[PDB]
Design an enzyme around this catalytic site. Sequence first.
Site, PDB file in Angstrom:
ATOM      1  N   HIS A  68      -7.136  -1.830   6.649  1.00  0.00           N
ATOM      2  CA  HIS A  68      -5.905  -0.921   7.337  1.00  0.00           C
ATOM      3  C   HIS A  68      -5.652   0.985   5.947  1.00  0.00           C
ATOM      4  O   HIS A  68      -5.206   1.877   6.786  1.00  0.00           O
ATOM      5  CB  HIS A  68      -4.277  -1.922   6.855  1.00  0.00           C
ATOM      6  CG  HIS A  68      -3.063  -0.806   7.056  1.00  0.00           C
ATOM      7  ND1 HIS A  68      -2.966  -0.246   8.818  1.00  0.00           N
ATOM      8  CD2 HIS A  68      -2.268  -0.353   6.668  1.00  0.00           C
ATOM      9  CE1 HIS A  68      -2.254   1.014   8.439  1.00  0.00           C
ATOM     10  NE2 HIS A  68      -1.815   0.828   7.123  1.00  0.00           N
ATOM     11  N   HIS A  78       1.684   3.677   2.339  1.00  0.00           N
ATOM     12  CA  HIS A  78       2.564   4.425   3.040  1.00  0.00           C
ATOM     13  C   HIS A  78       3.996   3.494   3.455  1.00  0.00           C
ATOM     14  O   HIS A  78       4.295   3.328   2.463  1.00  0.00           O
ATOM     15  CB  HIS A  78       1.890   4.031   4.777  1.00  0.00           C
ATOM     16  CG  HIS A  78       0.974   4.258   4.950  1.00  0.00           C
ATOM     17  ND1 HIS A  78      -0.315   3.539   5.330  1.00  0.00           N
ATOM     18  CD2 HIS A  78       0.035   5.766   4.897  1.00  0.00           C
ATOM     19  CE1 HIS A  78      -1.383   4.704   6.042  1.00  0.00           C
ATOM     20  NE2 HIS A  78      -1.445   5.928   5.340  1.00  0.00           N
ATOM     21  N   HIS A 130       0.894  -1.329   0.388  1.00  0.00           N
ATOM     22  CA  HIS A 130      -0.445   0.002  -0.222  1.00  0.00           C
ATOM     23  C   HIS A 130       0.927   1.646  -0.084  1.00  0.00           C
ATOM     24  O   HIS A 130       2.237   0.772  -0.716  1.00  0.00           O
ATOM     25  CB  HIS A 130      -1.086   0.306   0.963  1.00  0.00           C
ATOM     26  CG  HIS A 130      -0.969   0.076   2.609  1.00  0.00           C
ATOM     27  ND1 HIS A 130      -0.005  -0.886   3.300  1.00  0.00           N
ATOM     28  CD2 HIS A 130      -0.432   1.230   3.310  1.00  0.00           C
ATOM     29  CE1 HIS A 130       0.770  -0.972   4.129  1.00  0.00           C
ATOM     30  NE2 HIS A 130       0.172   0.626   4.027  1.00  0.00           N
ATOM     31  N   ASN A 141      -2.415   3.004  15.187  1.00  0.00           N
ATOM     32  CA  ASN A 141      -2.373   4.503  13.551  1.00  0.00           C
ATOM     33  C   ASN A 141      -3.460   3.885  12.966  1.00  0.00           C
ATOM     34  O   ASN A 141      -3.516   2.159  12.131  1.00  0.00           O
ATOM     35  CB  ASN A 141      -1.110   4.168  13.016  1.00  0.00           C
ATOM     36  CG  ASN A 141      -1.769   5.236  11.610  1.00  0.00           C
ATOM     37  OD1 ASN A 141      -1.671   6.273  11.039  1.00  0.00           O
ATOM     38  ND2 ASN A 141      -1.282   4.264  10.751  1.00  0.00           N
ATOM     39  N   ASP A 154       5.831   2.509   5.184  1.00  0.00           N
ATOM     40  CA  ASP A 154       7.005   2.143   5.794  1.00  0.00           C
ATOM     41  C   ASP A 154       6.952   0.490   4.444  1.00  0.00           C
ATOM     42  O   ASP A 154       7.539  -0.806   3.861  1.00  0.00           O
ATOM     43  CB  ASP A 154       6.739   1.184   7.127  1.00  0.00           C
ATOM     44  CG  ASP A 154       4.940   0.458   6.912  1.00  0.00           C
ATOM     45  OD1 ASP A 154       3.670   1.223   5.678  1.00  0.00           O
ATOM     46  OD2 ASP A 154       4.407  -0.571   7.211  1.00  0.00           O
TER      47      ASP A 154
HETATM   48  O1  LIG Z   1       4.763   0.799  11.793  1.00  0.00           O
HETATM   49  C1  LIG Z   1       3.499   0.950  12.271  1.00  0.00           C
HETATM   50  N1  LIG Z   1       2.853   2.034  11.868  1.00  0.00           N
HETATM   51  C2  LIG Z   1       3.217   1.868   9.961  1.00  0.00           C
HETATM   52  C3  LIG Z   1       3.607   3.358   9.889  1.00  0.00           C
HETATM   53  C4  LIG Z   1       4.189   4.486  10.352  1.00  0.00           C
HETATM   54  C5  LIG Z   1       4.491   5.675  10.386  1.00  0.00           C
HETATM   55  C6  LIG Z   1       4.455   6.199   9.254  1.00  0.00           C
HETATM   56  C7  LIG Z   1       4.558   5.358   8.082  1.00  0.00           C
HETATM   57  C8  LIG Z   1       4.078   3.948   8.237  1.00  0.00           C
HETATM   58  O2  LIG Z   1       3.759   3.253   7.109  1.00  0.00           O
HETATM   59  P1  LIG Z   1       1.434   1.637   9.722  1.00  0.00           P
HETATM   60  O3  LIG Z   1       0.367   2.464   9.943  1.00  0.00           O
HETATM   61  O4  LIG Z   1       1.680   2.077   8.164  1.00  0.00           O
HETATM   62  O5  LIG Z   1       1.231   0.497   9.205  1.00  0.00           O
HETATM   63  C9  LIG Z   1       3.094   0.973  13.384  1.00  0.00           C
HETATM   64  C10 LIG Z   1       1.808   2.448  14.093  1.00  0.00           C
HETATM   65  S1  LIG Z   1       1.928   0.860  16.012  1.00  0.00           S
HETATM   66  C11 LIG Z   1       2.376  -0.255  15.560  1.00  0.00           C
HETATM   67  C12 LIG Z   1       2.889  -1.396  16.783  1.00  0.00           C
HETATM   68  C13 LIG Z   1       3.899  -2.037  16.340  1.00  0.00           C
HETATM   69  C14 LIG Z   1       4.682  -2.323  15.079  1.00  0.00           C
HETATM   70  C15 LIG Z   1       4.215  -1.340  14.089  1.00  0.00           C
HETATM   71  C16 LIG Z   1       3.677   0.063  14.788  1.00  0.00           C
HETATM   72 ZN   LIG Z   2       0.302   1.906   6.957  1.00  0.00          ZN
HETATM   73 ZN   LIG Z   3       2.672  -0.941   8.447  1.00  0.00          ZN
END
Ligand SMILES: O=C(N[C@H](c1ccccc1O)P(=O)(O)O)c1csc2ccccc12
Ligand SMILES: [Zn+2]
Ligand SMILES: [Zn+2]
Length: 231
Positions: A148, A85, A83, A179, A87
């Site tokens: 998500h 985002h 997707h 998030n 990551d």
């Molecule tokens: O990495 C996590 N978020 C991903 C994300 C965060 C910030 C910016 C871009 C992005 O892509 P995401 O929202 O895209 O998954 C995450 C949030 S809480 C948690 C608890 C354990 C492991 C990971 C996390």
């Molecule tokens: Zn994401």
């Molecule tokens: Zn993620």
Amino acid sequence: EYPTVSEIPVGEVRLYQIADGVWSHIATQSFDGAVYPSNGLIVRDGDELLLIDTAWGAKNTAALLAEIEKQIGLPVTRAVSTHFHDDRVGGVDVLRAAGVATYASPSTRRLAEVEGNEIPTHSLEGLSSSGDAVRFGPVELFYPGAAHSTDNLVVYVPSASVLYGGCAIYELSRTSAGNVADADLAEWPTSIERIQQHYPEAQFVIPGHGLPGGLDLLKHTTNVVKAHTNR
Ligand SMILES: O=C(N[C@H](c1ccccc1O)P(=O)(O)O)c1csc2ccccc12
Ligand SMILES: [Zn+2]
Ligand SMILES: [Zn+2]
Ligand SMILES: [Zn+2]
């Protein structure tokens, strides 16, 4: 056995052989003063590799390619981002610079652009409607519906019975949603049910972050999402 977030120095990437010709890649990114682990997939296709998702950032993604060349020594010819985002697409410029053909759905490319994120070169057709599936080299790509994010894809390796759910699937130790700014909370459990219906035979289920498991990860995610829905 599986690398956890404590065991990986920020900047380094680990590979974990899931089955024959299938690895996950694990990296960590500091963020807001917390450290998060993050997964992608690598799938062997003859004498080339298909990459699924970046390692969350240019420096991490460069180290990913170096770790792949070090331990596997086969070329990464294509890469799919599941997707929009950071990551999943953070590091797509590094892949592109290295000569990797990067791919995403047109929905993902558009949303990346709006977010100002890096944008995969190629557009994956045939994934625009919930339940759509296409083969892409050694994997099947599946659009389960919004969850998500509205664009998330899941990836299945039929040869190894490995399901990669990306960030639409939570690991078991995550009991709160975290998030969800771009999520469709209303459609998410329905999308997860489509994954269950389409891949009932999956033996390994890889979440977007944290420890792999079985198909139990799906109803666990639905429980977390429904609890968050009722917050
Ligand atoms: O990495 C996590 N978020 C991903 C994300 C965060 C910030 C910016 C871009 C992005 O892509 P995401 O929202 O895209 O998954 C995450 C949030 S809480 C948690 C608890 C354990 C492991 C990971 C996390
Ligand atoms: Zn994401
Ligand atoms: Zn993620
Ligand atoms: Zn190309």
